[PDB]
Amino acid sequence: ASKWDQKGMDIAYEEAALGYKEGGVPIGGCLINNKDGSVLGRGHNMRFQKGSATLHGEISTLENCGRLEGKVYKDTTLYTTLSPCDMCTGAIIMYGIPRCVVGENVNFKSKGEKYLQTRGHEVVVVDDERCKKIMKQFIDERPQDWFEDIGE
Amino acid sequence: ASKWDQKGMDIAYEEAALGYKEGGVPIGGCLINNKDGSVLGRGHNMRFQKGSATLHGEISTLENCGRLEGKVYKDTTLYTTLSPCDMCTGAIIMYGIPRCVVGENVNFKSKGEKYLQTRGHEVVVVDDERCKKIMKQFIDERPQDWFEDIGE
Numbered sequence: 070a071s072k073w074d075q076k077g078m079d080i081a082y083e084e085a086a087l088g089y090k091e092g093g094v095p096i097g098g099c100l101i102n103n104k105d106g107s108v109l110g111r112g113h114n115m116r117f118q119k120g121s122a123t124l125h126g127e128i129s130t131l132e133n134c135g136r137l138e139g140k141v142y143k144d145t146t147l148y149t150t151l152s153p154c155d156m157c158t159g160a161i162i163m164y165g166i167p168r169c170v171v172g173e174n175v176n177f178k179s180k181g182e183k184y185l186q187t188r189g190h191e192v193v194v195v196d197d198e199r200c201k202k203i204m205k206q207f208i209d210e211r212p213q214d215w216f217e218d219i220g221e
Numbered sequence: 222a223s224k225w226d227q228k229g230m231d232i233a234y235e236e237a238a239l240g241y242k243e244g245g246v247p248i249g250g251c252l253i254n255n256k257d258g259s260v261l262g263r264g265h266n267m268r269f270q271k272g273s274a275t276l277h278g279e280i281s282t283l284e285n286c287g288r289l290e291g292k293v294y295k296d297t298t299l300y301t302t303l304s305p306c307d308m309c310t311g312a313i314i315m316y317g318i319p320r321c322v323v324g325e326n327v328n329f330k331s332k333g334e335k336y337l338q339t340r341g342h343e344v345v346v347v348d349d350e351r352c353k354k355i356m357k358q359f360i361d362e363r364p365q366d367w368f369e370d371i372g373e
């Protein structure tokens with residue numbers, strides 16, 4: 070188990086709330102070193118902020134950590150407020166991030182959640198009410214923008 | 222769709238060469254509309270040019286296409302000079318881009334190449350010598366730089 074999960078999810082939610090305030094998709098996250106709990110980086114979806122088709126919450130988080138030597142990712146945990154799509158799932162796998170803690174998978178979920186476990190990654194779903202509340206609201210008020218974010 | 226394959230790879234290779242000239246990783250791409258052969262966008266890896274951990278040739282290409290309605294990707298072809306990693310593979314899957322034409326899978330390949338087929342996509346490996354030559358030259362000269370790109 071990990072002692073940094075509360076810290077990790079609070080930060081990810083903090084990013085999601087910020088993104089929502091800026092008028093974008095309420096999905097945030099952060100990357101943490103499991104051994105000491107240091108924050109390698111944090112971020113949120115930037116589709117609307119930067120007119121970006123690739124900056125999902127998880128991707129923005131990884132971009133914010135900057136260029137890193139492959140070994141650095143090997144003992145970290147990626148925290149995301151929502152279960153990852155196939156692209157973000159791919160990012161986790163490609164870099165070898167061993168653990169993914171998910172805020173919730175009620176508002177959204179792809180084959181990536183199971184694929185992660187099939188590829189040997191540990192996935193933890195906390196079922197956080199805050200995350201579920203803000204994401205459901207966005208989906209309700211701006212469904213068209215939501216679908217654009219998941220290619221639908 | 223196949224009729225634009227020579228054009229698509231030409232552009233993808235031009236992007237790779239340009240990126241190489243810029244001192245970066247020689248991997249390029251472009252997304253073409255299967256209907257009229259129009260180029261929605263083209264790009265190359267920007268790791269060195271912008272200190273980016275997510276802008277692989279494929280991701281950069283999609284970013285350069287700009288925000289698009291989910292339906293637009295459903296009938297396009299993504300050309301990449303090199304077989305996609307799990308992240309870029311995931312991007313193709315999430316957006317529903319039906320075809321992925323690859324320059325070569327000799328210098329590199331991931332489980333994504335096949336996963337794309339399992340997920341219902343069409344994969345075509347042309348074995349382009351221009352692509353293989355410039356990529357092998359890069360790996361030979363700057364191996365550490367290459368490994369960083371694939372998180373190793």
Ligand SMILES: [Zn+2]
Nearest residue numbers: 125152153154
């Ligand atoms: Zn997502």
Ligand SMILES: [Zn+2]
Nearest residue numbers: 125154156157
């Ligand atoms: Zn995603």
Ligand SMILES: [Zn+2]
Nearest residue numbers: 277304305306
């Ligand atoms: Zn690649």
Ligand SMILES: [Zn+2]
Nearest residue numbers: 277306308309
């Ligand atoms: Zn890639």
